[PDB]
Amino acid sequence: MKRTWQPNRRKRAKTHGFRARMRTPGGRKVLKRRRQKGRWRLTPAVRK
Amino acid sequence: AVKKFKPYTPSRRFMTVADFSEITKTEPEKSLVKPLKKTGGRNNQGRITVRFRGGGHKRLYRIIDFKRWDKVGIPAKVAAIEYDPNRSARIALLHYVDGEKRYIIAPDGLQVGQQVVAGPDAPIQVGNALPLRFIPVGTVVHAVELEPKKGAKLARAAGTSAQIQGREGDYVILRLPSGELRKVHGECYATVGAVGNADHKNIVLGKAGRSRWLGRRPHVRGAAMNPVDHPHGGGEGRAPRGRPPASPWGWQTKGLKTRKRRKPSSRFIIARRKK
Amino acid sequence: TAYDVILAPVLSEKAYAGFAEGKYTFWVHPKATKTEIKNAVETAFKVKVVKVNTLHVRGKKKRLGRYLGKRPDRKKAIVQVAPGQKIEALEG
RNA sequence: GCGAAUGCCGGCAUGAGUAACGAUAAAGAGGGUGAGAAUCCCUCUCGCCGUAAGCCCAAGGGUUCCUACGCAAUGGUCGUCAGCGUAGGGUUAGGCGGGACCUAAGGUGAAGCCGAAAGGCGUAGCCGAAGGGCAGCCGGUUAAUAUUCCGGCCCUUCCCGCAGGUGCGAUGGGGGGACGCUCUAGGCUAGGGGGACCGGAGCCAUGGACGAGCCCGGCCAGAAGCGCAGGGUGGGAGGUAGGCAAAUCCGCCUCCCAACAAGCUCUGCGUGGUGGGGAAGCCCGUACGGGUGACAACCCCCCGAAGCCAGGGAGCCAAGAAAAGCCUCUAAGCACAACCUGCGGGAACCCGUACCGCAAACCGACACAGGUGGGCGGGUGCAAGAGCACUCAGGCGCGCGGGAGAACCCUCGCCAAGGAACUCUGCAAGUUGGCCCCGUAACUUCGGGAGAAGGGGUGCUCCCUGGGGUGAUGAGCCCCGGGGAGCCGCAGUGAACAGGCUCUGGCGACUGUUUACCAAAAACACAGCUCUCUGCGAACUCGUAAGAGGAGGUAUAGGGAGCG
RNA sequence: GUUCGUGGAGCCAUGGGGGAAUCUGGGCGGACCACCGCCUAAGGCUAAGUACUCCGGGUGACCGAUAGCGCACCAGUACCG
Ligand SMILES: [Mg+2]
Ligand SMILES: [Mg+2]
Ligand SMILES: [Mg+2]
Ligand SMILES: [Mg+2]
Ligand SMILES: [Mg+2]
Ligand SMILES: [Mg+2]
Ligand SMILES: [Mg+2]
Ligand SMILES: [Mg+2]
Ligand SMILES: [Mg+2]
Ligand SMILES: [Mg+2]
Ligand SMILES: [Mg+2]
Ligand SMILES: [Mg+2]
Ligand SMILES: [Mg+2]
Ligand SMILES: [Mg+2]
Ligand SMILES: [Mg+2]
Ligand SMILES: [Mg+2]
Ligand SMILES: [Mg+2]
Ligand SMILES: [Mg+2]
Ligand SMILES: [Mg+2]
Ligand SMILES: [Mg+2]
Ligand SMILES: [Mg+2]
Ligand SMILES: [Mg+2]
Ligand SMILES: [Mg+2]
Ligand SMILES: [Mg+2]
Ligand SMILES: [Mg+2]
Ligand SMILES: [Mg+2]
Ligand SMILES: [Mg+2]
Ligand SMILES: [Mg+2]
Ligand SMILES: [Mg+2]
Ligand SMILES: [Mg+2]
Ligand SMILES: [Mg+2]
Ligand SMILES: [Mg+2]
Ligand SMILES: [Mg+2]
Ligand SMILES: [Mg+2]
Ligand SMILES: [Mg+2]
Ligand SMILES: [Mg+2]
Ligand SMILES: [Mg+2]
Ligand SMILES: [Mg+2]
Ligand SMILES: [Mg+2]
Ligand SMILES: [Mg+2]
Ligand SMILES: [Mg+2]
Ligand SMILES: [Mg+2]
Ligand SMILES: [Mg+2]
Ligand SMILES: [Mg+2]
Ligand SMILES: [Mg+2]
Ligand SMILES: [Mg+2]
Ligand SMILES: [Mg+2]
Ligand SMILES: [Mg+2]
Ligand SMILES: [Mg+2]
Ligand SMILES: [Mg+2]
Ligand SMILES: [Mg+2]
Ligand SMILES: [Mg+2]
Ligand SMILES: [Mg+2]
Ligand SMILES: [Mg+2]
Ligand SMILES: [Mg+2]
Ligand SMILES: [Mg+2]
Ligand SMILES: [Mg+2]
Ligand SMILES: [Mg+2]
Ligand SMILES: [Mg+2]
Ligand SMILES: [Mg+2]
Ligand SMILES: [Mg+2]
Ligand SMILES: [Mg+2]
Ligand SMILES: [Mg+2]
Ligand SMILES: [Mg+2]
Ligand SMILES: [Mg+2]
Ligand SMILES: [Mg+2]
Ligand SMILES: [Mg+2]
Ligand SMILES: [Mg+2]
Ligand SMILES: [Mg+2]
Ligand SMILES: [Mg+2]
Ligand SMILES: [Mg+2]
Ligand SMILES: [Mg+2]
Ligand SMILES: [Mg+2]
Ligand SMILES: [Mg+2]
Ligand SMILES: [Mg+2]
Ligand SMILES: [Mg+2]
Ligand SMILES: [Mg+2]
Ligand SMILES: [Mg+2]
Ligand SMILES: [Mg+2]
Ligand SMILES: [Mg+2]
Ligand SMILES: [Mg+2]
Ligand SMILES: [Mg+2]
Ligand SMILES: [Mg+2]
């Protein structure tokens, strides 16, 4: 069987990345709620 | 006639293949006037609209120029008859005296090297493009045009041929392969003779493949549905049809004139459908 | 502004094994360029350098107590020097 | 103001020193370190994988890699060990994979269109890859880096100066790049097996044997040139409305000729200047490993690929991408310029590079019996083969063991006589099993049933003989056989991998698909048949609309419904 | 919309159809008519008084680490997805 989380750098970056938020009207809602809540990592960071 | 098979395996006993005898004119295909990739997509921007299309084999589009006023009065030379997976009929790779590559669907009974001209100064032989007022009455004709200078759209399938049934002033009366006596205008172009490949009816697809080769997904029947999707769905052990005849969107599928009644493309027909 | 250059020689055992040849490796500024290092050594050290080769060293995650952090992310360079002359200031 | 809300939070109990300690591949012994050793290091035996339980990459993970010092915590036990903690090092690229090259699905998006706003379509163009193009092979070095560092050797891009030649020159045109599936003829290579030939430290065990005795290795890379095997391409003249033309380029028609060819270009292989490697065994061996035995040998024969020539050839329908580099012709421009080939000198940038990568480091809360893409993946025998059995190189003994050998559970083996009598049912288990040779019915859509059912043989030794391939025509070496004569055992695919069969009905034509994670079916699908609608700005569907699917389709087409 | 939900349904804006006048011209005083009163629509701007506390300070019959904001502590962190 396959588990649910089969990780991928490029799929995670183009799916949950910063511009992947900012090109949508709801991703700006995300980027204005994470700053008010005070998260240190506003976008899930992809390690290089 | 028909390429057949003895039943050496099951799902081969009835599988018949059309005759590939006119295809001997060229074994490869000229890669000059067909560079456009046919983007094969069953759907619009997201939604499957035409249900159960897609799949199948990769197919490359052949750019035809059925606008026969591209070169008026310039003769041609039919040098090849080749296969076309887009249309249902084989096309004619024909050269020009001018020297320009051109793909035209091949009418009934072409050969190699005869002369054909897309102009009004043309005698009656199978292949020429002539206006409908210059088409004689009773002559079978195909690739006719509905409104002038809009290409060629009517009667382009295999074996079909419209026929001139008289004239009414400036509009000519011609019958279509349904049997609908319709008037069109007199300077749109038309290619005489039938299309051919009339063995297209006589082929049998054989197995569940050759639908999945061509790209038709399995068309699931409506009696095995659920009542969420189809009005015919559900029921305990094949319940009978639920008192409509129905499509999956409510409208009745057997005997409903869903044509737009007040369409401005009406008033030209003087008949509807031959029974 | 001279946008200047080399932090320190790495003083490692492979560095001192490259001391016998013309290698003379060192840390650099992390946003440098392999032409800028030749420009840096041939002017700041007044020598002739044939073949610079750089490599990007990732820092190790490191903790002191119960608070986890990481060491910095910094680049290391070697400089293949033209023969005959060498540097006479790096004698560690 | 608490004792109740299967209340919550934190601690501690019962269950209890109980189950378990994680594939039934397997451990034993002697030394060393150490306070402490079944568990750490070394040595001698035994077992397991060996189409992997071995090796190389891309994912993924992010220092887990190496050394030194230690066991606070972790390892289903201990542990001096550790993929555990502290510190110090370690990833070196013009040629490898990406960007400074291009493009497909898709996304963004000048112009334009639509929508209360957020916004949604959308030409040109841009992004977008395990797709195309592009210049690197061999060996050594560290404890940790290697196609990068070094040794040999060969190339590419750009610029500068000189020599020679030319009508040079594009985001423009043109050919090419440019392609399916299956079967495959010829040559070569990777890989592999022998030799009575070459070289090597050794040995004659225990009964026989100083000999065609045993064991190991008999290579790799390599420019120009030369041979072998293929791929591509007709060479000139005129006319021509076309390449949304500007052409000497391309397309078409006239051809004195060549024409299954040859010439000219493009690959692969062998040889090739030369360079590197060079064992098994023996001494020094803590580890690591180092000297070694040489002046090492580096020769011949065969099997032979899915890999290379390759864009080969044949057949079939379901008809099998784009653009860029590069080749050629020109517009504006320039012809003291610009372009091409040589000769010398320079410049070649940013990121990845360690380790695990079919697992203890990836995903599964775990050092989890699960899953994870691509390549090499040996030898011997079973006809063959990635199957089966064993074993090279490589690793591993699975991180709890030691006793006794109760009932009982799982797995496996066997059994007098009956042979399905137990049960809802030959469920399960067992027989048949591989190959060759006779024979094979009812019925039929003439294919099939069918491997029907039933049987006979299979081991080893010797003799004769038909050939085929390489080699030279056979000597040598592999393959397909046939006949005769014997020998042993209960048993001769002597082990392992390998159909129980037939008749009769029901249902579904058949192959296939589904209820991930209790139902693989008489359910779904299917070819085919019938009905109905739609003539195109089609019908129908998504979307408020634009627009898109239909479809760059045309009643022999498309949509819906029903039976199959 | 105003309390106005179609009721006798005014007024304020209008999605559509018809459609003028410029003080002897119009609108309103809740179907409507006459009188009598109020005001000039079909252009635009305007501080002050009013709401709230990221932040600054003072107070509290406010609390005292299971309270108080989720965090008095290196917290929107470790951790889960
Ligand atoms: Mg072209
Ligand atoms: Mg069908
Ligand atoms: Mg159902
Ligand atoms: Mg649904
Ligand atoms: Mg319904
Ligand atoms: Mg680098
Ligand atoms: Mg209590
Ligand atoms: Mg309880
Ligand atoms: Mg509790
Ligand atoms: Mg006890
Ligand atoms: Mg017990
Ligand atoms: Mg008990
Ligand atoms: Mg126990
Ligand atoms: Mg055990
Ligand atoms: Mg022991
Ligand atoms: Mg001991
Ligand atoms: Mg001792
Ligand atoms: Mg032991
Ligand atoms: Mg990675
Ligand atoms: Mg992790
Ligand atoms: Mg660590
Ligand atoms: Mg240590
Ligand atoms: Mg410990
Ligand atoms: Mg422990
Ligand atoms: Mg100690
Ligand atoms: Mg380690
Ligand atoms: Mg460590
Ligand atoms: Mg780019
Ligand atoms: Mg650059
Ligand atoms: Mg691009
Ligand atoms: Mg482009
Ligand atoms: Mg596109
Ligand atoms: Mg797009
Ligand atoms: Mg958009
Ligand atoms: Mg690429
Ligand atoms: Mg590539
Ligand atoms: Mg080098
Ligand atoms: Mg030129
Ligand atoms: Mg060789
Ligand atoms: Mg010898
Ligand atoms: Mg003896
Ligand atoms: Mg040999
Ligand atoms: Mg040998
Ligand atoms: Mg060689
Ligand atoms: Mg071959
Ligand atoms: Mg192109
Ligand atoms: Mg590596
Ligand atoms: Mg390594
Ligand atoms: Mg694998
Ligand atoms: Mg794990
Ligand atoms: Mg374990
Ligand atoms: Mg595991
Ligand atoms: Mg797999
Ligand atoms: Mg045998
Ligand atoms: Mg064999
Ligand atoms: Mg096996
Ligand atoms: Mg071994
Ligand atoms: Mg062990
Ligand atoms: Mg153990
Ligand atoms: Mg264990
Ligand atoms: Mg027992
Ligand atoms: Mg018995
Ligand atoms: Mg018996
Ligand atoms: Mg019974
Ligand atoms: Mg009974
Ligand atoms: Mg059974
Ligand atoms: Mg051969
Ligand atoms: Mg069936
Ligand atoms: Mg299930
Ligand atoms: Mg099941
Ligand atoms: Mg459309
Ligand atoms: Mg139909
Ligand atoms: Mg049915
Ligand atoms: Mg009202
Ligand atoms: Mg009003
Ligand atoms: Mg209005
Ligand atoms: Mg009014
Ligand atoms: Mg009033
Ligand atoms: Mg006013
Ligand atoms: Mg405050
Ligand atoms: Mg608190
Ligand atoms: Mg307290
Ligand atoms: Mg996370």
Swiss-Prot record, chain A:
Primary gene name: rpmH
Keyword Ribonucleoprotein: yes
Lineage: Bacteria, Thermotogati, Deinococcota, Deinococci, Thermales
GO biological process, one term: translation
Gene Ontology MF terms: structural constituent of ribosome
Coiled-coil stretches: none
Known function: Found on the solvent side of the large subunit.
HAMAP family per the UniProt record, alphabetical: Ribosomal_bL34 (MF_00391)
KW Ribonucleoprotein (keyword) present: yes
PROSITE patterns per the UniProt record, alphabetical: RIBOSOMAL_L34 (PS00784)
Pfam families per UniProt: Ribosomal_L34 (PF00468)
Similarity comment: Belongs to the bacterial ribosomal protein bL34 family.
GO terms for cellular component: ribonucleoprotein complex; ribosome
Keywords: Ribonucleoprotein, Ribosomal protein
Subunit architecture: Part of the 50S ribosomal subunit.
InterPro entries found in the cross-reference section: Ribosomal_bL34, Ribosomal_bL34_CS
Additional information: The open reading frame (ORF) for this protein is entirely within the ORF for the RNase P protein (RnaP). The two start codons are separated by four nucleotides.
Region (Disordered): 26-48
The name this protein goes by in its record: Large ribosomal subunit protein bL34
Curated annotation (Swiss-Prot), chain B:
Matches recorded under Pfam families: Ribosomal_L2, Ribosomal_L2_C
GO CC list: large ribosomal subunit
Residue span of region Disordered: 222-275
UniProt keyword list: Ribonucleoprotein, Ribosomal protein, RNA-binding, rRNA-binding
GO-annotated molecular function: rRNA binding; structural constituent of ribosome; transferase activity
Composition-biased stretches (Basic residues): 256-275
UniProt cross-references to SMART domains, sorted A to Z: Ribosomal_L2, Ribosomal_L2_C
Domain of life: Bacteria
Residues passing through the membrane, by range: none
GO terms, biological process: cytoplasmic translation
Bias type Basic and acidic residues, positions: 229-239
Family, per entry: Belongs to the universal ribosomal protein uL2 family.
UniProt subunit comment: Part of the 50S ribosomal subunit. Forms a bridge to the 30S subunit in the 70S ribosome, contacting the 16S rRNA. May also make transient contacts with protein S6 during translation in the 70S ribosome.
UniProt function note: One of the primary rRNA binding proteins. Required for association of the 30S and 50S subunits to form the 70S ribosome, for tRNA binding and peptide bond formation. It has been suggested to have peptidyltransferase activity; this is somewhat controversial. Makes several contacts with the 16S rRNA (forming bridge B7b) in the 70S ribosome.
Protein known as: Large ribosomal subunit protein uL2
Organism: Thermus thermophilus (strain ATCC 27634 / DSM 579 / HB8)
Gene that encodes the chain: rplB
Swiss-Prot record, chain C:
InterPro entries according to UniProt: Nucleotide-bd_a/b_plait_sf (IPR012677), Ribosomal_uL23-like (IPR013025), Ribosomal_uL23/eL15/eS24_sf (IPR012678)
GO biological process terms, semicolon-separated: translation
Keywords: Ribonucleoprotein, Ribosomal protein, RNA-binding, rRNA-binding
Gene that this polypeptide is encoded by: rplW
Gene3D superfamilies recorded: 3.30.70.330
Species per Swiss-Prot/TrEMBL record: Thermus thermophilus (strain ATCC 27634 / DSM 579 / HB8)
Entry protein name: Large ribosomal subunit protein uL23
HAMAP family given in the database record: Ribosomal_uL23_B (MF_01369_B)
The protein's role, per its UniProt record: One of the early assembly proteins it binds 23S rRNA. One of the proteins that surrounds the polypeptide exit tunnel on the outside of the ribosome. Forms the main docking site for trigger factor binding to the ribosome.
Annotated family: Belongs to the universal ribosomal protein uL23 family.
A GO CC term attached to the entry: ribosome
Subunit (UniProt): Contacts protein L29, and trigger factor when it is bound to the ribosome. Part of the 50S ribosomal subunit.
GO terms of molecular function: rRNA binding; structural constituent of ribosome
